[PDB]
Amino acid sequence: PSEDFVVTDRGGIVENSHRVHAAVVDAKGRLLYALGNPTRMTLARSAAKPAQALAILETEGVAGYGFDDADIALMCASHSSEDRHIARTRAMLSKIKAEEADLRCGGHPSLSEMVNRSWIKQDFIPTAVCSNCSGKHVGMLAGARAIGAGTDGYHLPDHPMQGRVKRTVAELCDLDAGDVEWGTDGCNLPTPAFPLDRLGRIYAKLASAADGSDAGEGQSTRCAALAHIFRAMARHPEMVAGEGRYCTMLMRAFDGALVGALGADASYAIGVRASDATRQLGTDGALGISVKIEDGNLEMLYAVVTELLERLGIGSPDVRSQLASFHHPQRVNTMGVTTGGVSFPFKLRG
Amino acid sequence: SEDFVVTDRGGIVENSHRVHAAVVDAKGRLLYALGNPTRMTLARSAAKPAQALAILETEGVAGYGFDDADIALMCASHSSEDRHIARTRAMLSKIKAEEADLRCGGHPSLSEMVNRSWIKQDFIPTAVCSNCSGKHVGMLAGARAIGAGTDGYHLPDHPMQGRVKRTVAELCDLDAGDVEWGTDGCNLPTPAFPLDRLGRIYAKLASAADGSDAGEGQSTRCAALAHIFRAMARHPEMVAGEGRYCTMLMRAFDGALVGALGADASYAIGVRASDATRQLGTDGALGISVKIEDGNLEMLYAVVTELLERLGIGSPDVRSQLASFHHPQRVNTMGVTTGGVSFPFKLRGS
Ligand SMILES: [Cl-]
Ligand SMILES: [Zn+2]
Ligand SMILES: [Zn+2]
């Protein structure tokens, strides 16, 4: 497993190499395939957002605000700060009678180079509603208001909204509280770390809940909420990230068969609804995939995730070809000459 | 040897980066190491002083009257500031060439501050803006000086590139077959060789400067190497630019060493003999070369600065000018410190 790498070359000469870790799990979290160390203790960063959205949606009273599926997809989002994302953030603040000054996240350069270039041309200074995490933050303000906890300090560990987040994360992971560690995210919220396979487990449970809903099975309130989060992400993938973004292009290509989301510093998680491909992989239910590039390189992350989907047989060559520019990153110099490429000397193990 | 620089979020491991380093004496003998000090490595722009030597040794180039700042630009990966473009143009005029003779292409500036001003003006960079433009003018100079014609000066079959290839292997003390060649972002042949030989090149620069200063008899080659060292140290803003690590490093040391970046996170430093180098157990100059395996530049500058502190090169006051690179900021969008950088590696002798 110490040999699982993605490697870039220049004229066949090794340039950089990147250690890969991955877990492929069933709906109960049993490990089916791995790369690297599948239990690596890993900060999930923004890939935890579906679990935080579950804590929001399980907060009594939040249903009264009338958030719709696109709002819930924005809670699940690391969005590009496109004008539609900012506008929806402001519209969600109005639903809870809050204002931009109540947010405790900060502005940052857009995750999209094209958006950021427009901002630079305009001397635009991003503010709190422009945060890629702005939907999650409005959701947590919503829950704070709904239980009467006060919006001041909704982002601090001592607040009941964060106590709810912390218990919800551990429960979805099937871990004791002491086995989840906490830091602080760029958006200024508590953010969890846990073994990488458990990030796969969370997304397997998302997809499993979607399968149960679609088949008409009786569900707990939790499974119904998980099915709702899956549906929202898959129905509004442009809210989850934006134009040209991997997460958006991936979920559009698969048209409801899976959901996926990025974690900052190069983690990724995918929940796959039961299919011919999942059955061929040896399980009778939904499937979860999680990935971490040890050194944090995002370009390599998206190449590896796409390569892994091909090796697992998920989708078809035609579906996955929508991701070709991520799968095989361009290596072209300033005069248009191809100078190298990207290779995948790793081996899936069962 | 498992040597890493490790970033954390709240003490939880975020990313880790494998480090390779060689510390060599003036004859290339290995004194200290991290990782694999003989890793086959693409030197990229850190090879520029060897390419400048090939230029300066070309018959007739002396008649063009290149000065020290011109030679510093030949050795540069500059930020494309207005002064770098103006010097490139002055060098083209010295050889009666024009911008359309260049065979490098434009690219987003290596400086974020420069790139933002370009984006604001809708400026599209051209050949004269290349971070390698000084090297390219020098190659055009050599091609013209021997009557080989400017057309195709960048191609492997051109006599200028034959001179570069030979000069690189000679400075490395390697046979031609032990240097591999690809194509750079700037569309020139670019060499790969064991990482320690990159340190050997820079040790030879600093040794030549020591010998020029001590008034030793010198070959034409050692005299030119001494000139290259002097030029980089006298004009470190030409080698890179405002705010750049290479510039701030050489300014802080005020002639005691030179250093330059290789794209995809290699670094090389040539250290003139000093109380520090004697304390490390050599009676001459010293060379340092570093590669971050995954290509991360931020981690490269942190590691190089930590290495200078471990090796005792400079004073605490001198190295404090590099504090922002040594321990990069880890502060979120709300001004809260969220993490840090650590150096759990240990330098081994021999
Ligand atoms: Cl390139
Ligand atoms: Zn966040
Ligand atoms: Zn170049």
Numbering used by the authors:
A (entry chain A): 3 to 352
B (entry chain B): 4 to 353
What did the published study say regarding this structure?
The ReAV enzyme from Rhizobium etli, a representative of Class 3 L-asparaginases, is sequentially and structurally different from other known L-asparaginases. ReAV is a homodimeric protein, with each subunit containing a highly specific zinc-binding site created by two cysteines, a lysine, and a water molecule. Two Ser-Lys tandems (Ser48-Lys51, Ser80-Lys263) are located in the close proximity of the metal binding site, with Ser48 hypothesized to be the catalytic nucleophile.
The absence of Lys263 led to only subtle structural rearrangements and atomic shifts within the active site, largely consistent in the four protein chains. The Lys263 mutation affected the conformational state and hydration pattern of Ser48. Instead, it interacts with the carbonyl oxygen atom of Leu264 and two water molecules, mimicking the arrangement of two water molecules in the typical triangular configuration, though with increased O…O distances (2.70–2.90 Å). The zinc cation nearly fully occupies the metal binding site, with a refined occupancy of 0.8, shared with the coordinated water molecule. As observed in the S80A mutant structure, the side chain of Cys249 exhibits a chemical modification, modeled as S-hydroxycysteine. In the K263A mutant structure, the major rotamer of Ser48 shifts in response to the mutation, moving away from Lys51. This leads to stereochemistry that is suboptimal for the nucleophilic attack and prevents activation by the basic Lys51 side chain.
